[PDB]
Structure 1
């Protein structure tokens, strides 16, 4: 092909990431830096890197299945391009389905007006994607609010202390920042954040 081909070259690397993960991971970060002020990292640069590293780290076993389950048997003989699509697709399906909400399913299957369904995997390819995305958004924002809390605590505390002494005049927005960074680092929790994302993915 030519035209639609190049088109696919444009869209594809967006889709693949969308197809998998990483859309829920980044938002956690952006929510990070939105606490503790400025960018405090090169958003288009490093926080793309880290958030990619995790993603590969998580989805790895699925992949290893996919290869062991496909190329090495596809190289040589048996299936060609058909139960390739079947046997390689189905792990994606099941995987994705695991974290999907129950409702958004009913929502989009309803709007598209699909008849009686039997195979969950037989629920077609396209249908899953948006419900998946939306769900994962909900999850994401949840996790974010779980993040913020101690910091809000911080600002309230310091502001209060100031209010106690007649400090009304002074803008506590400045003072709290070094503490934020201190009591983030002294408790090491950055590890706790990357892990907390790692396990709480599925559990």
Structure 2
């Protein structure tokens, strides 16, 4: 009944091939990158942080926030499987469940309702919905949540820029572009409040 060693290896290599998809569609990678995309866009820098470090910080942030779920998968699924306590079929299910639970904690009821009706299936409990339908609902909630956080992050930088523009216009110099003057002020206020540490607390802790 249990999959043979040859077939289990084939399944293992298959999931490694789809590993980039699982990061950007099932884990918290999508929300972090979108929020960090807003932060780069909000400040006057266009490509200054560069794409490489943002993804690298996002990957490390995901491993931080996915550590509880990854450890739960390790304990429940990997440990019985390594010790040959359980078969491969049930070990795979034991690993799938923590991922499903985490995606439910970061989704909305309205999003699930739309896709479960879209799939044209019958279900009564959100806890046993297929992962094929949970994934589109999860990322849709993630994109909406990220836009909410990004909108809140965009407001203080908009506040600073509007104040500087008003001050320059009030002083009479209708000739100077507000962006050049406002950029150091936005950066200074981003540093002396330790903005990134605050963003870490409101982003890593946003999942719970």
User: Which digits, 9 at most, give the CA deviation of each residue in 1:6-57, with x for residues without a partner?
Assistant: xx589613311122111010011111111222222121x1111111111001
Contact 1:25 1:140 in 2 (8 A): yes
Q: 1:154 aligns with which of 140, 157, 160?
A: 160
Q: How does 1:67-82 map to 2 (within 5 A)?
A: 67-82=74-89
CA distance in 2, matches of 1:164, 1:91: 58
Q: 1:51 aligns with which of 37, 53, 58?
A: 58
Contact 1:158 1:176 in 2 (8 A): yes
Unaligned stretches of 5+ in structure 1?
A: none
Q: Give the TM-score, by structure 2 length.
A: 0.87
Number of equivalent positions: 197
Contact 1:90 1:121 in 2 (8 A): no
Q: Using the TM superposition, give the Cα deviation of residue 102 of structure 1 relative to its aligned residue in structure 2, in angstroms.
A: 0.2
**Structure with greater proportional helix content:** 2
Worse-matched range after superposition: 176-185 or 33-42? 33-42
Unaligned stretches of 5+ in structure 2?
A: 1-5
Distance 1:123 1:9, change over 3 A: closer
Q: 1:27 aligns with which of 21, 24, 34?
A: 34
Matched, 1:126 2:132: yes
CA distance in 2, matches of 1:192, 1:13: 30
Contact 1:69 1:87 in 2 (8 A): yes
Q: 2:100 aligns with which of 93, 101, 105?
A: 93
